[PDB]
Symmetry: D2
Subunit: 313 residues, 4 copies
């Protein structure tokens, strides 16, 4: 489909909304991302039964997480959620609405992880935090009132990468705790090898994820560009056998579309149960716009339901 | 994606009498229904009085309660084949996951009952669900319509028919790879995924359904035949599921977009790696299982609205 | 490809009176024609007698000799705009590279002369080239037809018209991003590349051309209006050029394939990174220069045949 | 478009035509390729005014080339042509028909190069030969009766790779002799980074270039897999500035489609004049089937004409 009518206007408004340029400093981009994000969060105005912030001891130091509990009960399913933002931007705050809605619709406790950001903390800082936090959720199921046997990982964009890699790390360690993975338009190839979608939808006219911003993200994340060949950076090059069932959500007008769909297919070739759906008429990051985009609401509903019944399994 | 590996395997394994093709489709469908092995809390067959006589329906009740949400479901089969039986697993599972009463409508089949036979029954069945909320133990303000392939067409047209009479009982429409253009105006996808190598929906079978369904070629120009040419304003919110390797993909995706252009909230999602009719294969296809989960949940929260 | 960089730059730079839009198109076209700065060995304007009166044509002779190959060329402009002047550079260059005499036909424009006006002239002009080989110094066994956009439509329909009368003077047809379906039956590409951001062929301009061209909506069902619905058997070999970012892409590619299905040799090639009408931009677009080179050469060796 | 009606039959016939498997020895695959190729060559039955075989001294030893002269005259345009075959298969013989027709239609002398094959001669053996032969043509213009100022490179598939890399090598050396490049469905990314087309069209049902055969080619060509990162292996990662005007021909149902179209686009981004055309309804290698495929005839006509007027320039 063409770009949704309402989304043209949304991008039109972000046209003269202080645009990104490669020489901008990280603090300014972070601030703008947070402020813009919080408009959408406040718009959503999601309820939640119970919410609190906790500290998880990571290899790199204390890791903050937000626990969203949508109902009472001592053995609820859990989702460890990783926010997007290019490995450089975002926080539990920027994605607070998505996490509340996810909890409410799935009935699962959502644990949103405030993983360390680049360039202050280069790859593999965030990957370590992401595994450490998910493992801690498994180990501390009792304190949390969750079922240690019903933990899923999930994340959007750079967070989809962290979810995918956490599942790989658990697999590599011979661990059972990741039962399900939902990858929301993940980045799975962090090298400069192109796909058609990466070039097709990354021009300045798409705004949300441009070629300039992608390269800038890549420069912040990596100590040296060859680090991108690591399967913990580019999980599309990993051994994909024995990974947990996967739902991969993609967007039609998204640079990362091709690689997301390729990841789903490659999972299948190694015997993993895996589904790839493409949301038509929308851009990368569309889920965060759900208060004003019907595709965003449909996506949260699908993701929530897929986790609740582990439908792909 | 390419074609999912198990689906290639299945396909590689796989002027006729209308009665003979029905038996074959029936036989094949029931293999999948038995594989599903789905439970249901309560199930019963009823007789909806319709304009062409008694319309058989099957009521799937997943739980107790008055004022449950409702889904009027229309089975696929190209307007000529299929029954409440061929789609029983999908309806049990839909009922169970959505928490809603599903009324599966055994609409009149062509070529015996040609267009607009099935369309009248589709509308009569749905409005009868609307007029009997109390007896059904369903809420008259939470009625959805849903259907697959030729069923998706009836679902969409039932919504159009209700709109046309100023009726507002249709609150939500899930169109599972629907047929919205029944004329021969080709789309890229219609030509691309209709070769013999696809089997389930070939150019020959499509042309054959069309000859069974219509009394004359020109009847496909009707908005009740080809909803994609109808006025789409003031229609209920829509979820349109499409398959990647499906002749009807393009028209399905176009229908969602045309709905948007007339101010209706609507979402088109494409399941990669799969063919038309993949929902019925859910017991051996993860895409099938995800679709039923999405459809159930989208109806439960009316997410697109 | 994405949109080629220079073309984005060009686009970013860029109830009306029919006369006013013509002047604007004319003015814009002539900028490109002067940029081209093309030579021609011999050029002259002639008056072909046609069924609606005198049809102006322009004869471009690239070299000496009797029995040169011939190309009857039809300019674009949505049936309403354009002239032999707006496409002069393309015809000089075509003539020069193919070695063939190009007869550019100044067909009658709508809304003054509505369908089937231009179609009769298109056929009359071509058959007149056929009947006057001697006077033109061209071979009556080496006649091709060619045209861009609305011109591609006339080229294809002229071939259909000749076929319909048992006439065999049309030996080859090059359809440069043709309009083969003039009904509103949407294709994915028609919706995808017709937004205001594309400018050259928007949904509004297409709907406007259609209202100028036809006396009534139903006339677009004619095979002389929408050739993609005509019988395509026994038609001359075809080269179909399409643009990647073009509303008419899908129907263009479908026309080549439908030709194949009726046993006609036909090739569809898609130029990436470019929009409808890109051939006329050849002086600043390498894709334009390649297209003219391909078209000239394909006609010279009748390569698809 | 769908797969051409006649091409289904062609692939149907190649279904039970002794199919490839990864453990086959190189000699057997070479023999089958040659025999199959020569059916098409004999079918074409192309004339040529003058033809002879010569020896070109390369860094690695004598290099055989075939000179196709379509007309008389002492300063004709030239095309140095590189046959396809995965870097492992093929010869001047397998592509003899295409070269004669090219010469005849373009009016250029075609020099078809019998470059060294893998695994006997690993990368960069063939790349060295390909540059050496093109340079020799420039240096020996007088002996050949060609214009040293009007030399083009051209090649199909693995040969498109060699043509692209020869142009890069000349550029890197600050040389002017390559004036034009025609890349016929080239392979420009020899790493295992996927594109959608690479996965979509490489199943056994397409026969001509399957995932199995692509990996086998890759194993023969490279001494070690990391050699594939070299820009002389994967020219899509090279600096593409100041390269000669480019025509890139692609096929709709070809694993290499995406990367070919990406190469054309990337050339443009560095200011190179570059056109990508996609032939619908056909597979990789379709040009060699021109006696029975109208798309093959159209392609040779286009390629010939583009070289004759250097139309993209």
């Amino acid at each position: 489909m063409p770009l949704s009518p309402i989304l043209r206007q949304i991008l039109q408004q972000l046209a003269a909304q202080l645009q990104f340029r490669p020489d901008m400093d990280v603090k300014t981009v972070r601030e703008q991302f947070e402020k813009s994000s919080l408009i959408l969060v406040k718009m959503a105005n999601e309820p939640i039964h119970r919410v609190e912030d906790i500290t998880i001891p990571g290899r790199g130091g204390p890791i903050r997480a937000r626990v969203y509990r949508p109902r009472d009960g001592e053995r609820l399913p859990a989702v460890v959620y990783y926010h997007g933002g290019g490995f450089v931007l975002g926080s539990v705050e920027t994605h607070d609405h998505v996490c509340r809605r996810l909890a409410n619709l799935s009935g699962a406790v959502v644990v949103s992880v405030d993983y360390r950001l680049a360039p202050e903390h280069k790859f593999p800082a965030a990957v370590e935090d992401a595994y450490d936090a998910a493992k801690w959720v498994a180990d501390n199921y009792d304190k949390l009132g969750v079922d240690n046997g019903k933990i899923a990982v999930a994340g959007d964009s750079a967070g989809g990468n962290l979810a995918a890699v956490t599942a790989i790390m658990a697999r590599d360690r011979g661990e059972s705790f990741v039962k399900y993975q939902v990858l929301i338009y993940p980045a799975v190839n962090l090298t400069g090898s192109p796909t058609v979608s990466r070039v097709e939808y990354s021009g300045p006219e798409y705004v949300i994820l441009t070629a300039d911003l992608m390269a800038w993200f890549g420069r912040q994340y990596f100590s040296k560009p060859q680090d991108a060949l690591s399967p913990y950076a580019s999980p599309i090059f990993a051994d994909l056998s024995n990974l947990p069932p996967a739902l991969v959500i993609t967007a039609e007008y998204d640079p990362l579309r091709d690689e997301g769909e390729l990841y789903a297919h490659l999972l299948k070739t190694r015997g993993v149960r895996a589904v790839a759906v493409r949301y038509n008429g929308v851009i990368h990051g569309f889920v965060n716009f759900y208060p004003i985009l019907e595709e965003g609401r449909e996506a949260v509903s699908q993701i929530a339901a897929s986790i609740k019944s582990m439908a792909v399994a």
